[PDB]
């Protein structure tokens, strides 16, 4: 057998969502900052198609790439590569990357707790690992500053009638819409989404992010004390960080309140504090979850293989 | 099974000398420069013992670690880890690292030739790969500036009698001595070295290096035109650049002349140019050799294993 390249990946999933990590074989992308590097990865597409697409990885698969830190205070940097795009920050993946680091030995595992400082495309992230018996049990990450752009704003949907929605950002751009004003959601999702880029034009005060990536159809959230449980659906991960930003923009969640995202295993998260971002209110999310490694692999490519990018 | 860490290595030998390369699992050592990083690797010892020592790697094994470049003009940096020490530059290994990069796909392979700029502990190195049919056939590296410290200097050897020797540096510190003034060698080797560290006390005008690493016993060299063929024993690659430096400090070799080192697969060399360094003359070695990849591996370490550093 012959290959034109070899990447070594350590498989890892967090509460179900796959978040494979590339530990070697791939040179750090060009760019002076991590942000730009992720961009390159998104434009080039060569790397994401090789690992994401088949016959190497079925649909709905994630794979994160470790890159040399570009920020003084950061032990390691990485880029999230979702089957759809390369977001500036992902919850489910910032969890896998945190886990692989510890379970693979790249970072020194301190018990019963170990503190890391990773650097995603969107910005630096604090991480608190709960390691026990040589294994990161639970990972708690301080996501980047999240916020809600528009709130209760009309939306001319060519679908049917007019409904009000809210746009937020908790690692990625979302457009939250109560399934009430909706009455297959996949179809109506693609619709409500595109419409938002048109009528509402999103903007991030610290990154060249200029669009609404997805739409999540939510349902009324219940309260059990300080723990709000919501059965929202586009997956989860950065989904909640965004919703909490809105939930906090409507007085439905105060600082110090823990939000529990639906069980895609229930993704935990808490509103650590409130911060002012780009002349606007923002929350400091605390996503937390459990990730297990699934193995290791070395992907290759035969030069005569008709699917160099994969079908 | 359980492990406390995982390093992914791609096996590679150059003309026989093993030069395995670590592509992932290992975080870049602490230090503002590559030089200092290699040092750390040498002091810490934790990494070199894990990979070099058994039961993971028999004696006489080399393993190079790829590290994020610290020099603007360098696609990749690495540290050489020899079973004895961590030299500032190694020929046989600068060849394997060059090869792995291309054959593993870390670097874009251009045919029929591809130019890289690697960064070893001692300094930047130009590399010219002869790639054909998706495989680096031959690797030509422009070693760091080599030179000869002392020439024909007395040496009080407690062994027997007094002999004259010469000290040089071509990636590492050596003390060349004609087997004529010797009349086994391995035993009287480390013996003549200590003497050099005493009577001749080495110094490199750019690196912390200040001692004689090894000793090579040589005999007269033959000539067949412009190609000098000679026998040497001490580590033949980095030994050449040291030799030529002396052969050049004695008139026994001129710029543009090729030097073929004994086949310990004869390691080729050429004295590209003559430059100045630290106030004294020096040569610009051009090592050449062929390398292949032996495969890939992921080393591990059970916590209950009584040999964490290997015996």
Quaternary structure classification: homodimer
Class per helix and strand makeup of chain A: alpha+beta
Greatest chain-chain interface? A-B, 28 and 28 residues
Tell me which CATH architecture of the largest domain in chain A applies here: Roll
Distance between the termini of chain A: 21 Å
Number of strands of chain A: 19
Annotate the secondary structure layout.
Two copies of one chain form a homodimer.
Chain A: E1 6-14, E2 17-18, E3 20-24, H1 34-44, H2 46-52, E4 63-67, E5 76-79, H3 91-104, E6 113-119, E7 124-131, E8 136-142, E9 147-148, E10 153-156, E11 162-169, E12 173-178, H4 185-199, E13 214-218, E14 222-223, E15 227-230, H5 238-247, E16 258-261, E17 268-276, E18 281-289, E19 291-300
Parallel strand pairs in A: 3-4, 5-6, 12-13, 15-16
Antiparallel strand pairs in A: 1-2, 1-3, 1-19, 4-5, 6-7, 7-8, 8-18, 9-11, 10-11, 11-12, 14-15, 16-17, 17-18
């Amino acid at each position: 057998m012959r290959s034109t390249k070899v990447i070594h990946i350590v498989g890892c999933h967090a509460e179900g969502e796959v978040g494979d990590v590339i530990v070697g074989g791939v040179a750090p992308p060009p760019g002076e900052t991590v942000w730009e590097q992720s961009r390159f990865i998104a434009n080039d597409e060569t790397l994401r198609n090789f690992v994401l697409n088949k016959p190497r990885g079925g649909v709905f698969r994630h794979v994160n790439l470790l890159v040399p830190p570009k920020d003084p205070r950061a032990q390691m940097g990485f880029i999230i590569m979702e089957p759809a795009d390369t977001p500036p920050m992902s919850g489910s993946n910032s969890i896998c990357v945190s886990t692989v680091l510890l379970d693979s030995g790249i970072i020194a595992m301190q018990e019963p707790v170990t503190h890391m400082v990773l650097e995603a495309p969107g910005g630096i992230i604090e991480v608190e690992a709960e390691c026990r018996n040589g294994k990161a049990e639970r990972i708690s990450v301080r996501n980047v500053p999240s916020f809600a752009d528009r709130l209760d704003a009309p939306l001319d949907v060519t679908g049917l009638g007019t409904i009000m929605v809210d746009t937020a950002y908790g690692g990625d751009s979302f457009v939250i819409v109560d399934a009430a004003q909706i009455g297959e959601p996949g179809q109506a999702r693609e619709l409500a989404e595109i419409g938002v880029k048109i009528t509402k034009a999103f903007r991030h005060p610290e990154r060249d992010w200029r669009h609404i990536s997805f739409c999540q159809i939510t349902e009324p959230v219940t309260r059990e004390g300080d723990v709000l449980t919501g059965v929202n659906t586009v997956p989860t991960g950065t989904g909640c960080s965004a919703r909490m930003a809105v939930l906090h923009a409507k007085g439905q969640m105060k600082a110090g309140e823990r939000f529990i995202g639906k069980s895609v295993t229930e993704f935990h998260c808490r509103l650590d504090k409130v911060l002012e971002l780009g002349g606007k209110p923002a929350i400091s999310p605390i996503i937390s979850g459990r990730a297990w490694v699934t193995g290791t692999s070395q992907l290759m490519l035969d030069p005569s293989d008709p699917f160099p990018h994969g079908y």
